[PDB]
Amino acid sequence: LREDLKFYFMSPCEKYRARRQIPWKLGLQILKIVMVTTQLVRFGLSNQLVVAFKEDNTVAFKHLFLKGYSGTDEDDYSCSVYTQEDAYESIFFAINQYHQLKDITLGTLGYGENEDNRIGLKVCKQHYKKGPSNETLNIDNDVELDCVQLDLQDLSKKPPDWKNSSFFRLEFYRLLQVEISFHLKGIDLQTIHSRELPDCYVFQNTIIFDNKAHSGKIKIYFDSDAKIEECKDLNIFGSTQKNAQYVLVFDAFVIVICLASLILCTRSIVLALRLRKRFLNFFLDQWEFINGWYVLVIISDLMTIIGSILKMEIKAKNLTNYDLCSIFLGTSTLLVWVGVIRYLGYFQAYNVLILTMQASLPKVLRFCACAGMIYLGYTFCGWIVLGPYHDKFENLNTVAECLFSLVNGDDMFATFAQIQQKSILVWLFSRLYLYSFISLFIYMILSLFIALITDSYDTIKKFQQNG
Amino acid sequence: LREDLKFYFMSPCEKYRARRQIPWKLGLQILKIVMVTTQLVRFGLSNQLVVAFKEDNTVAFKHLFLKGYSGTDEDDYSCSVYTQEDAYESIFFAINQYHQLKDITLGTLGYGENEDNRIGLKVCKQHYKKGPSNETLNIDNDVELDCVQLDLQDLSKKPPDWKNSSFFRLEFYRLLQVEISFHLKGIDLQTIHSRELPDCYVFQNTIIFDNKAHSGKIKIYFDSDAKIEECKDLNIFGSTQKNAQYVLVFDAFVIVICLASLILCTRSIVLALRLRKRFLNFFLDQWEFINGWYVLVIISDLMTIIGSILKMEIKAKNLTNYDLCSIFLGTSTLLVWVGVIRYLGYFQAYNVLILTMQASLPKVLRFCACAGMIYLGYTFCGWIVLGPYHDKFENLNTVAECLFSLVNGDDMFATFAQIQQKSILVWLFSRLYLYSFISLFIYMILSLFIALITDSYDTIKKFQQNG
Amino acid sequence: LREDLKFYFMSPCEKYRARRQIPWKLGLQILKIVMVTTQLVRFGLSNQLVVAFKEDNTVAFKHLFLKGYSGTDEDDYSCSVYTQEDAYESIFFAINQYHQLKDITLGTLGYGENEDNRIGLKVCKQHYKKGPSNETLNIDNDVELDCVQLDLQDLSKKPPDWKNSSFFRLEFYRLLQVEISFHLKGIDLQTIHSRELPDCYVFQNTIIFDNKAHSGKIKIYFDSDAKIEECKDLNIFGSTQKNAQYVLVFDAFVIVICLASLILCTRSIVLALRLRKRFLNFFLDQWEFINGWYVLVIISDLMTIIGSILKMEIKAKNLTNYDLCSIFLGTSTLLVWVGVIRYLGYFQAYNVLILTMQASLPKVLRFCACAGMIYLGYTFCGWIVLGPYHDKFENLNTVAECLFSLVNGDDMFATFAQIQQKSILVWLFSRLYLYSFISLFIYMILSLFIALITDSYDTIKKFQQNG
Amino acid sequence: LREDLKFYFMSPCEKYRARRQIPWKLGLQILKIVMVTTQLVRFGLSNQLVVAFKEDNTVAFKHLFLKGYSGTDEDDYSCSVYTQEDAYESIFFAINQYHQLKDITLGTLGYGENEDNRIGLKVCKQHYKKGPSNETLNIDNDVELDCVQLDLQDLSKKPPDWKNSSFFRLEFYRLLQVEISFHLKGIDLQTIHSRELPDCYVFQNTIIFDNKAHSGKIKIYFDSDAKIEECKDLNIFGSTQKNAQYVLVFDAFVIVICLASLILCTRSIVLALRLRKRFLNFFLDQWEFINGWYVLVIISDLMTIIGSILKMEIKAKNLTNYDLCSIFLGTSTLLVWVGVIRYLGYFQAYNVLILTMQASLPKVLRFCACAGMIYLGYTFCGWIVLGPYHDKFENLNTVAECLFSLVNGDDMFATFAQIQQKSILVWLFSRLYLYSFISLFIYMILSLFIALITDSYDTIKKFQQNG
């Protein structure tokens, strides 16, 4: 029983000296790291190409349909117009470029059927109801909705009477929004060199001329949603795509091995907890017989299993919404590579470092509460005071990120210089605030982490040497 | 009496074990943090919308009335012109855009009455008195002031003779300033979806073509001052605004609870100081019976009270000048959230960290004097030497901010590279200066904070363990 | 024998007191540092001029032949076009500028003979074979190659029928690439003031209008390859270039002295290893008699020898591909200047610092494994999750560089702000990821280096003082 | 004698208790800091205005006379042209703008007499002598110099035959340089509001169209040299400037007090050195009786004296070349404010910090040699390898500044990303280089400063406590 406990608590390098104790339970993990990492790598390299094609097409559409687009968006919208004539020019430019698409596009593009199954362009208006521009406003608080369909045989009639229509009498003082929507077909023909059957895309596009604010500016949003659809009629010679089976079977293998690892870890947690029960019953050492790394391994395997299920679901139904699956697979890989530290601890001279890391969290995290109370106080004060006058302090989230950057010393001179001296009182308070915060956190609080970590090191070092 | 002193000096977790000692005095504070923080949050979320509307309108006005405005100002002024014809073009552009406002604005704008109660545009000139452009200047040191009113029925006469008037013979060698001023009305109609009565604004605008320097450049300043006025005649259906009462009553509650907390803290300071008098009289422990946190709490509550008074004053009189009120409320919230640390000290394992923080100021602040003498010396030397040749060293304030950034390691390579090699002597001195300063402060002085903080940690740790 | 071992293990300052022991073996090294450093300096100052001329000519060519070039490239290509007409305009612009080169260039340029020994311009197309723009694509997966030669007496015929040719019917839906290629001659006439014979260059230029992606954008690549050729017929009065002999003989001297130093070091390693054999045989001190600095010196000299051989080879055959030779010479110089620390250790008060540096690697490098496992986990997770949404996380290499920067605190606020809030799930994960990583590495792991280095210092300090 | 030594070695706070020992020797210094600092402040505030006027005029001239100037220079030159027609357009634009100056300037400008005492414009050419554009160059290695004078009555003749002159047949293949030079008069009329007599300026301007490189680009340099001259005939009513006397007399007072302080310090060094001689003779304590602060004070006063002499010289002769005087005054002020630390040491609890600072240089500076050998090795290797491929590594000075920034952690991610992957070998070496350097200096060497400073702190702390 003493030998049993010694065996249960030792390492595999020492356990191997038993005449039948081969380390296959470790071999499974050594397989698992490689299999999971290669699954992640192949998934990422596949995902990247689809993302690149979709975003390249989005940029090309922005250049084609937005007048005067400079190639870079504003903070959340592609471009803006401040003049009543510029809005008309942009609105008509988008329609005229849609009309001429076949003669100006460099891609494999074509027209797609719309919601009415027509090939055509739909544009809609939203005006506050009940038509001077002030002093007597007779508005009535709800929205008129108007829409019109512009088809190719309309937008082409040599005399484009559609510009002269009564629809486009916009009355910008009532106007909330103008929306232009259309469908396009594309092909990622780049893939043809592999002799795989090229896949089509269907792009659903909307251009939003948005002025909910009524603050003298119209914001132009461009949004593009792509579906894979199905090659309608591509007579391109070559072969179809079936590699999908090689993805599905590999995901099945990954799921199987992760389940096997989870079974092994749960079994090990059971046997050892029983041994503790045996130890408790034996005679009138620590209560925690469970190896902590098994919890991490179990979590890793569960997340890998569910993430692989999501990936198989996405591929089977031919989706491109990779957010949640990417999160599960990435976090699982993170925990798997963290779990490798379990095997460095056996070799000595890493052990004191690992023990220092493990022993330092219970005090670093306790320091973070005392520091966080002050950090929250400065977050609220900075947001309320410097917010109207400083780009970094616009909202509590950005204030928190800015202060966290300042604690680590990043981008500090710009933080001082970015606030204008329009109000001397607020500027003086800004200097007081910034000097106080930076001094308090960099020269004292940040160094207390150094103090704590250094002193936690010496205890473990002196414990290890004293024994 | 011994039990009394023990009770007076202990914690509420231990004090609760007395048969009648419920912690209501702490419950009041736990209410107060929440109430003050929610007051700050609601104030900020209200303030942000008004600021956003005013600044969006300012940007729209800059785009409308400034010729060739690029969307970003220069360092303190919107744009500048260097040519005699460009000044005329900008001056006439502003007037022509004002004339056509109804046909070019995307907002709810309209014309506002001016100082003479006319609807019109006022422009004024300031020329050095006493009319070649040099070698014989007959100037006489004081300013001619000329003004003219341009009304809509003047600026509209098909033949705009106002451009041909003798007023605009500017003689830029004598010219100090040309100022264009007008009033506009606006509505933040965005709010209408809440069925609150929309509020109007009145914008007072001035465009200043400023060349006091006479240095070959005219600086164009745009300034816009907004008042809330009063919806003149908006027949928009819906309801008026009364929520203001919900703000006033909530501020009243906040003031009441802050006064209650202040009363409790002052009472506690009195009773305890008397106990010290009793202790002094008792027999032939430390002189400081007063809990230091009460001073912070009293200051916090006083600032909250006066800030809430200012907020109620602003809302009652319908102002938008939030600077001082924001300062009081933000600093009060900062101190309130700092005061939470009082309650972490009871739980142990935060106590050594709090004691280290409290014990480290009396030596960090004493080090700051010895460091500050050197820092001041470098500030003066950098300002006098590198100031004409380096954008960061233009004035003592910016020199101080730059050096404080350099001590923390920020934006260092740009600091070296930003000075041109026009003069080799000054460049060599700049390298000597920057290497000396950065070495002295980063590798020695900055690390002395680490030394001080780490060693202050060990005293408290060894005091706590030794007892 | 005891005196022998004492002599063998001491320093030259003490060894000099023997009646015949002059330090010539150190004099050779003191010569070697200077000779190698001056070789590097002269090589770099020569290389820089050729690189500057070639790159200045490349920039001038980009301005001449690329329509609307702004002076700065995009991330890997000079400029791009998104419209079917812009591609034609750029393609014809390049040819027209080539036709008019004699009248628009500011340099000493001239036309160079092409592959067919003609003076002329070659342009080629690559179209997917087998000619609507979709729904029925009859492509057949391999490439048509077409080329045509445009000579000066063609591109000049007053009626430039070459624009009307059937060649330029591009059919951009099939188009892979259009390539324009030509030769130019130049002279670095700047050198003439030295009365050295000026050298010619031959520039081989290719302009690639590349749209392999078919993603609605054509990428324009400009590449220029320069050869030295040979002054064809420059009647400029002066003298030819022969200094090359002064380079060759100096390289020969450097090789000779480096071989001598290597011989001395290998001889010293032999004698001392024998002494250890003698010490082993003497009686029933440490096994490592070899001085570690000799290994560094031998490596330095070998790399210097082979690098100088490569430099002589380059100069003899008149190449300009300096990559590998620069690597050998630079690394050799790095190791040579590192080897100087050998001589600071003799003077005391540097010895404890050198011993601390030497004693700290065996634990810093062991900590790097435990830290690297976590760092790899975060690299994979960041690449898979934030990659589609963040410019810094596009690929594993850039993720590794970004995380390594973040550990050192660089460019942190931009790292937070650069990811858009398009997807709330990914944004929340990004905040979790960034706060966790930055906290874990800056406040704990980075400070463990401080702990390790500080404690390694005290052991050596206390060992040195105790003896 | 024992009391004498005690008096000589104590502090003024204790020395004051002698019945006649008033601290006037300290009062002189307390006066001196204020007087020197105010001299520096007044000098800087005066210098700044003249610099601002001169540079504002320079920017206005750049906008007036350079075609298409964008408002920001290139790295050392205002703008560049790459096409043979652009050079002609810029050259003629400068002359035409000079011709029309009276009608386009916004300043008080006027024409100034040239070297021939004419009012006129001089332009000069420099062509390699001995007139195809290659394959047969008949150049002869020295420079033709041609010049022509364009006067106002020439540049005005309605038919400006000067453009058609044979002078402007530039032959850009031989051309080295074209230079345009002219004189202007200006007035800083801004000062008139003080009723001081406004001062004139004379601007000497040169525009250099420089293509020494012959690398396909012409660089356009603009240089402007301003002299104060003397108001020629300004009939502006007011008063002349005499405050200059208030500057001269104040500088005289500063010189007098600095000489007095130097006399006192030298006298104190003499008396104390004699006392040491007395102490040596007294009987069979440390050799260094001299107070170290006196050396700093003497240096400060000498530099202040010579700097004030230079300032008086500059003002008397009406110069604007402030470089050397600014250096002396700034360094003197730096040392004066450093000398204040002498008086903080008396108050205790600063003494241990000052002693730690003084005791830490003899080991930080010794560590800097061992670190500097490695730093030099990396400087040479980086310059030779990454120099052709990285903007930060162009030359040894910039390499040194970049590496010094990297040691302090600044601008690191850009340092990785700024090198293109054109050559995979150099890119791989760049990653090896950057990771090795950053790891070695940040995680080990930089932390050794923390170790040294922290341990130097504890010795002084334990010495001070043990006594």
Output the 3-class SS for chain A: CHHHHHHHHCCHHHHCCCCCCCCHHHHHHHHHHHHHHHHHHHHHHHHHHHHHHHHHHHHHHHHHHCCCCCCCCCCCCCEEECCHHHHHHHHHHHHHHHHCHHHHCCCCCEEECCCCCCCEEEEEEEEECCCCCCCCCCCCCCEEEEEEEEEHHHHCCCCCHHHHCHHHCCCCCCEEEEEEEEEEEEECHHHHHHCCCCCEEEEEEEEEEECCCCCCCEEEEEEEEEECCCCCCCCCCCCCCCCHHHHHHHHHHHHHHHHHHHHHHHHHHHHHHHHHHHHHHHCCCCCCCCCCHHHHHHHHHHHHHHHHHHHHHHHHHCCCCCHHHHHHHHHHHHHHHHCCHHHHHHHCCCHHHHHHHHHHHHHHHHHHHHHHHHHHHHHHHHHHHHHHHCHHHCCHHHHHHHHHHHHCCCCHHHHHHCCCCCCHHHHHHHHHHHHHHHHHHHHHHHHHHHHHHHHHHHHHHHHHHHC
Tokens linked to D356: 């730690």
Tokens linked to D190: 């801004």
Tokens linked to C341: 């620390």
DSSP character for C445? I
Residue C175's contacts (CB-CB under 8 Å, 6 or more residues apart) are C125, C126, C127, C211
> Neighbouring chains of D at 3+ CB pairs within 8 Å?
B, C
State whether residue A447 sits within 8 Å of chain B by CB: yes
CB contact under 8 A, D453 and B455: no
Residues B307 and B254: their CA atoms lie apart, in Å, by: 11
Q: Which residue, among B194, B205, B337, B395, would best test binding to A if mutated, counting the most A CBs under 10 Å from its CB?
A: B337
Place of tokens 């604690």: A407
Tokens linked to D232: 């020629």
Distance of CA D422 to the CA centre of its chain: 38
Residues C307 and D302: their CA atoms lie apart, in Å, by: 53
State whether residue D393 sits within 8 Å of chain B by CB: no
Place of tokens 């949404």: C389
DSSP character for C260? H
- Indicate the burial class of B117 (C-beta count within 10 angstroms; 0-12, 13-18, 19 or more): exposed
Residues D44 and D443: their CA atoms lie apart, in Å, by: 42
Place of tokens 């220029």: C224
Residues B267 and B291: their CA atoms lie apart, in Å, by: 12
Query: What separation in angstroms does the CA of C384 have from each of A352, B57, C377, D196?
Result: 33, 42, 11, 70
Residues C56 and D201: their CA atoms lie apart, in Å, by: 39
Residues B235 and A136: their CA atoms lie apart, in Å, by: 6
Tokens linked to D229: 């001259």
Q: How many other CB atoms are there within 10 angstroms of residue D422's CB atom?
A: 9
Amino acid letter, A234: L
Residues B265 and A414: their CA atoms lie apart, in Å, by: 42
CB contact under 8 A, A354 and C370: yes
- Asked if D200 and D232 count as a contact pair (C-beta separation under 8 A), the reply is yes
CA angle B292, B297, B300 (to 5 degrees): 135
Residues C198 and C200: their CA atoms lie apart, in Å, by: 7
Place of tokens 């973040």: C406
Kindly list the residues from chain B whose CB atom is less than 8 angstroms away from the CB atom of residue A378: 334
Residues B47 and A411: their CA atoms lie apart, in Å, by: 28
Q: What is the dihedral of CA B269, B274, B280, B285, to 10 degrees?
A: -30
Residue window 283-302, chain B: list those with CB within 8 Å of chain A: none
Give helix D323-338 / helix B351-386 axis angle, nearest 10°: 150
CB contact under 8 A, A141 and B324: no
Residue B38's contacts (CB-CB under 8 Å, 6 or more residues apart) are none
SS3 C339: coil
Place of tokens 């020295």: D142
- Asked if C61 and C205 count as a contact pair (C-beta separation under 8 A), the reply is yes
Residues B417 and B398: their CA atoms lie apart, in Å, by: 17
Q: Which residue, among B75, B177, B215, would best test binding to D if mutated, counting the most D CBs under 10 Å from its CB?
A: B215
Residues D263 and D266: their CA atoms lie apart, in Å, by: 5
Kindly list the residues from chain C whose CB atom is less than 8 angstroms away from the CB atom of residue D423: 323
Backbone angles phi, psi at B174, to 5 degrees: -90, -15
CB contact under 8 A, A438 and B350: no
CB contact under 8 A, D334 and B218: no
Residue window 196-225, chain A: list those with CB within 8 Å of chain B: 211-218
Length reported for chain D: 467
* Domain ranges across chain C: 2-50+243-347, 66-227, 351-466
Q: How far is C146 from chain A (nearest CA, A)?
A: 19
State whether residue B334 sits within 8 Å of chain A by CB: yes
Residue window 6-65, chain D: list those with CB within 8 Å of chain C: none
Q: Give me the total of CB pairs closer than 8 Å, taking one residue from chain C and one from chain D.
A: 225
Tokens linked to C315: 């100069």
Amino acid letter, B264: L
Distance of CA B102 to the CA centre of its chain: 35
Q: How far is C156 from chain A (nearest CA, A)?
A: 30
Give helix D446-466 / helix C351-386 axis angle, nearest 10°: 130
Q: Where are the beta strands (DSSP E) in A32-187?
A: 79-81, 110-112, 120-128, 143-151, 175-187
- Asked if D351 and D464 count as a contact pair (C-beta separation under 8 A), the reply is yes
In this structure, are strands A175-187 and A110-112 parallel, antiparallel, or unpaired? antiparallel
Residues C49 and C69: their CA atoms lie apart, in Å, by: 25
Query: What separation in angstroms does the CA of C215 have from each of A187, A188, A196, A241?
Result: 9, 8, 18, 21
| Nearest Cβ partner for B448 among D368, D402, D457 | D457
Backbone angles phi, psi at A200, to 5 degrees: -90, 165
CB contact under 8 A, C188 and D81: no
CB contact under 8 A, C185 and D370: no
Q: Which residues of B411-442 are buried (b: 16+ CB within 10 A; e: fewer)?
A: bbbebbeebeeebeebbebbeebbeebbbbbb
- Indicate the burial class of A13 (C-beta count within 10 angstroms; 0-12, 13-18, 19 or more): exposed
Instruction: Give the residue among B206, B459, B137, D437 at the shortest CA–CA distance from A455.
Output: B459
Amino acid letter, D51: V
CB contact under 8 A, B444 and D360: yes
- Indicate the burial class of D338 (C-beta count within 10 angstroms; 0-12, 13-18, 19 or more): middle
SS3 D218: strand
Place of tokens 């820092």: B375
In this structure, are strands D120-128 and D175-187 parallel, antiparallel, or unpaired? antiparallel
Query: What separation in angstroms does the CA of C461 have from each of B157, C443, D363, D370?
Result: 94, 27, 13, 17
| Nearest Cβ partner for D216 among C107, C402, C408 | C107
Residues A15 and A9: their CA atoms lie apart, in Å, by: 10
CB contact under 8 A, B187 and A214: yes
Residues B417 and B432: their CA atoms lie apart, in Å, by: 14
Residue window 144-183, chain B: list those with CB within 8 Å of chain D: 172-173
Please state how this structure was obtained: cryo-EM
Q: How many other CB atoms are there within 10 angstroms of residue B138's CB atom?
A: 12
SS3 A182: strand
Q: From B210, which residue of chain D is nearest by alpha-carbon distance?
A: D106
Residues A421 and A389: their CA atoms lie apart, in Å, by: 9
State whether residue B235 sits within 8 Å of chain A by CB: yes
| Nearest Cβ partner for A455 among B43, B102, B461 | B461
Distance of CA D270 to the CA centre of its chain: 38
Residues C301 and C259: their CA atoms lie apart, in Å, by: 7
- For the stretch B310-319, contacts whose Cβ atoms lie closer than 8 Å and that sit 24 or more positions apart, written own/partner, are B311/B43, B311/B251, B312/B248, B312/B251, B315/B244, B315/B247, B315/B248, B316/B248, B318/B228
Residues B125 and B116: their CA atoms lie apart, in Å, by: 18
Bridge partner list, C143: C128
Query: What separation in angstroms does the CA of D291 have from each of D275, D277, D278, D302, D361?
Result: 13, 15, 17, 18, 18
CB contact under 8 A, D449 and B443: yes
Kindly list the residues from chain A whose CB atom is less than 8 angstroms away from the CB atom of residue C423: 323
Backbone angles phi, psi at D220, to 5 degrees: -110, 110
- Asked if A95 and A120 count as a contact pair (C-beta separation under 8 A), the reply is no
Residues D378 and D371: their CA atoms lie apart, in Å, by: 11
- Indicate the burial class of D404 (C-beta count within 10 angstroms; 0-12, 13-18, 19 or more): buried
Distance of CA D443 to the CA centre of its chain: 34
Q: How many other CB atoms are there within 10 angstroms of residue D29's CB atom?
A: 19
Q: Which residue, among A173, A443, A444, A458, would best test binding to B if mutated, counting the most B CBs under 10 Å from its CB?
A: A443
- Indicate the burial class of C300 (C-beta count within 10 angstroms; 0-12, 13-18, 19 or more): buried
Query: What is the enclosing helix (H) or strand (E) of A224?
Result: strand A218-227
Q: How many other CB atoms are there within 10 angstroms of residue A345's CB atom?
A: 16
Q: Give me the total of CB pairs closer than 8 Å, taking one residue from chain A and one from chain C.
A: 222
State whether residue C85 sits within 8 Å of chain A by CB: yes
> Neighbouring chains of B at 3+ CB pairs within 8 Å?
A, D
CB contact under 8 A, B333 and A380: yes
Bridge partner list, B208: B179, B221
- Asked if B340 and B297 count as a contact pair (C-beta separation under 8 A), the reply is no
Amino acid letter, A401: E
- Asked if C409 and A408 count as a contact pair (C-beta separation under 8 A), the reply is yes
SS3 B406: helix
Q: How far is D165 from chain C (nearest CA, A)?
A: 20
Q: From D337, which residue of chain B is nearest by alpha-carbon distance?
A: B377
- Resolution of this model in Å is 3.0
Q: Which residues of D31-62 are buried (b: 16+ CB within 10 A; e: fewer)?
A: ebeebbeebbeebbeebeebebbbebbbbbbb
Tokens linked to A351: 């052990």
Amino acid letter, D155: L
DSSP character for D240? -
CB contact under 8 A, A451 and B446: no
Kindly list the residues from chain A whose CB atom is less than 8 angstroms away from the CB atom of residue B405: 412-413, 416
Bridge partner list, D368: none
Bridge partner list, C124: C147, C179
Sign of CA dihedral C288, C290, C294, C299: negative
CB contact under 8 A, A449 and C447: yes
Amino acid letter, C361: L
State whether residue D417 sits within 8 Å of chain C by CB: yes
Sign of CA dihedral A218, A222, A223, A227: positive
Residues C306 and C364: their CA atoms lie apart, in Å, by: 33
State whether residue B350 sits within 8 Å of chain A by CB: yes
CA angle A11, A12, A17 (to 5 degrees): 110
Residues C56 and C188: their CA atoms lie apart, in Å, by: 11
Backbone angles phi, psi at B228, to 5 degrees: -80, -25
